[PDB]
A paper describes a structure:
Reduced glutathione (GSH) provides the cellular first line of defense against oxidative stress-induced injury, which can be maintained by NADPH generated mainly via the pentose phosphate pathway and its rate-limiting enzyme, glucose-6-phosphate dehydrogenase ([name]). The glucose 6-phosphate (G6P)-binding site is located between these two domains.
To elucidate the molecular basis of the reduced stability and activity of Canton [name], we examined the crystal structures of WT and Canton [name] at 1.9 Å and 2.6 Å resolution, respectively. In WT [name], R459 forms electrostatic and hydrogen bond interactions with D181 and N185 on the adjacent helix (αe), whereas Canton mutation does not, resulting in loosened inter-helical interactions and displacements of the helix (αe) and a proceeding loop consisting of K171, P172, F173, G174, and R175, several amino acids away from R459-interacting residues on the helix (αe). In particular, K171 and P172 are the key residues involved in positioning of G6P and NADP+ in their binding pockets. We further mutated the R459-interacting residues, D181 and N185, to alanine in WT [name] to determine the importance of the inter-helical interactions and found that these point-mutated enzymes are biochemically similar to the Canton variant; they exhibited about 20% of the normal activity, with lower KM values for both NADP+ and G6P and lower T1/2 values. Taken together, these data support the importance of the inter-helical interaction between R459 and D181 and N185 for catalytic activity and stability of the enzyme and provides a structural insight into the biochemical defects of the Canton variant.
Residue numbers in the entry: 28 to 513
């Protein structure tokens, strides 16, 4: 478009703006992906100049010498307004500043809230009252947390919705910006090989996994307030569940997609303790550096905290496609690897003619690291043998698409806000369902304070988690052997 566009970084002085938002909007700018007439306005409490923003942020830009002119033009299009987050006069100054930009009263305005949630309500109120374009569109970009339970999320939502239409609100769940998460829809709905088997007649279980190999890294006191279910399970994992489970949408229009996601969540009952395993990591005495330290060995964590650093939970989608199929959500810190993954395990073939030698087929979508899709399946054992053995059909992006840069999630998502595409942003009704599913459990945990099961730093987590997975119908043999073909 030829319209002026203004990108307002609310909280421009903070760490997140410095290390992530300023570098992302630079990358989009550098790559020629933004509108020609774009300006960037920082707003925060400190009395900073553009030269200070540049000094703090440009080390994270990965700028090259050849980009020097583009960089000069980028900083020429930047400005900074000092102000407080609930001061009417400050927002007035911000509005006037924006009006003074080239066609500024006409401009489309995008507000990125690079702020803590304790100022969300004051910032949204003030933007609405003072800084909205009367001609351009107005879009607000908000990051987690969105409440900490159903009642607290409803309060924020009801505040924002009283001021902003759903088509002005862009709630980030950054998994929705990742390459292979966005692929889930194409894989499922562009292919006949995945279509007729994607149902309860063929699928024994679905496993949605998020593992990190580091602990809390001295920042445990922050984590301790919310825990792993609020951090990862209620948002990122549940989003992956929705994209795995959803019926095929009427179109790829933003709200046809998000309608199908909500429809999935509305069929999920509130999870109970029965289907939950919680863990907390302890130090590995045979380990090195951080790995010798448990969760309670972080001095910012409250003494005797029972906060879980690991959760496995089983949900069920109560509908025709999914009736009975367990969806296992599993996540933890200080585990054996970094990995996020979707895995479908297929049922056994009926009418076995291979004398119980066959294993269940599996489809794996590995989100990170090392983006890949593969199907574990049976082939005749190569050479002079007749017995089936497990093998796979593989697609690895690092080998197949060596030269192709995959954008960071924040690159993709910020660009989507410019384009007005809400497909990959969390809708108000979707948010509410997510909290409805998990709030009873979260409240029970806060009330009864169950003691999480210790697991050692660097392990796969508590063995009770594997037991839960087996109980609900996941089969593990440990016979599959993969050799990296390179
Ligand atoms: N293109 C590629 O890069 C590619 C393609 C094919 C295979 N491979 C590699 O080959 C290796 C094996 O592949 P895979 O992980 O798909 O198959 P797998 O080793 O058969 O593992 C299947 C699943 O079982 C889980 N598990 C492990 N022990 C368990 C237990 N005792 N009880 C219950 N569940 C258990 C694993 O958990 P975890 O998630 O905790 O391990 C994994 O989720 C992996 O390293 C994989 O990365 C790579």
């Amino acid at each position: 478009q030829s319209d002026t566009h203004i990108f307002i970084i609310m909280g421009a002085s903070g760490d997140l703006a410095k290390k992530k938002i300023y570098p992302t909007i630079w990358w989009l700018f550098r790559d020629g992906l933004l509108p020609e007439n774009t300006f960037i306005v920082g707003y925060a409490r400190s009395r900073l100049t553009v030269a200070d923003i540049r000094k703090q942020s440009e080390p994270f830009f990965k700028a090259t010498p050849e980009e020097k002119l583009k960089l000069e033009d980028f900083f020429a299009r930047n400005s900074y307004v000092a102000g407080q987050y609930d001061d009417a006069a400050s927002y007035q100054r911000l509005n006037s500043h924006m009006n003074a930009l080239h066609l500024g009263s006409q401009a489309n305005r995008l507000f990125y809230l690079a702020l803590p949630p304790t100022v969300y309500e004051a910032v949204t109120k003030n933007i609405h009252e003072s800084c909205m374009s009367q001609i351009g569109w107005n879009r607000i970009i908000v990051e987690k947390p969105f409440g900490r339970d159903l009642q607290s999320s409803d309060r924020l939502s009801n505040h924002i919705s009283s001021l902003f239409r759903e088509d002005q609100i862009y709630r980030i769940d950054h998994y929705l910006g990742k390459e292979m998460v966005q692929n889930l829809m194409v894989l499922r709905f562009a292919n006949r090989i995945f279509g007729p088997i994607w149902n309860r007649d063929n699928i024994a279980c679905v496993i949605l996994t998020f593992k990190e190999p580091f602990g809390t890294e001295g920042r445990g006191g922050y984590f301790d307030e919310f825990g792993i279910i609020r951090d990862v399970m209620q948002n990122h994992l549940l989003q992956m569940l929705c994209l795995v489970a959803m019926e095929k949408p009427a179109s790829t229009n933003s709200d046809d997609v998000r309608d199908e996601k909500v429809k999935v969540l509305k069929c999920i009952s509130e999870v109970q303790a029965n289907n939950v395993v919680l863990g907390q990591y302890v130090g590995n005495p045979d380990g090195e550096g951080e790995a010798t330290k448990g969760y309670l060995d972080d001095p910012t964590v409250p003494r005797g905290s029972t906060t879980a650093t690991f959760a496995a939970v089983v949900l069920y989608v109560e509908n025709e496609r999914w009736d009975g199929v367990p969806f296992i959500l599993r996540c933890g810190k200080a585990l054996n690897e970094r990995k996020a993954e979707v895995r479908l395990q297929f049922h056994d073939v009926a009418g076995d003619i291979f004398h119980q030698q066959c294993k269940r087929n599996e489809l794996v979508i590995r989100v990170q690291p090392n983006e890949a899709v593969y199907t574990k399946m049976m082939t005749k054992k190569p050479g002079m043998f007749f017995n089936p053995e497990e093998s796979e059909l593989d697609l690895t992006y690092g080998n197949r698409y060596k030269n192709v840069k995959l954008p960071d999630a924040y690159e993709r998502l910020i660009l989507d806000v410019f384009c007005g595409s809400q497909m990959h942003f969390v809708r108000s009704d979707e948010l509410r369902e997510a909290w409805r599913i998990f709030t009873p459990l979260l409240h029970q945990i806060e009330l009864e304070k169950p003691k999480p099961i210790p697991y050692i730093y660097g392990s796969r987590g508590p063995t009770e988690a594997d037991e839960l997975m087996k109980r609900v119908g996941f089969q593990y043999e440990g016979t599959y052997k993969w050799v990296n073909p390179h």
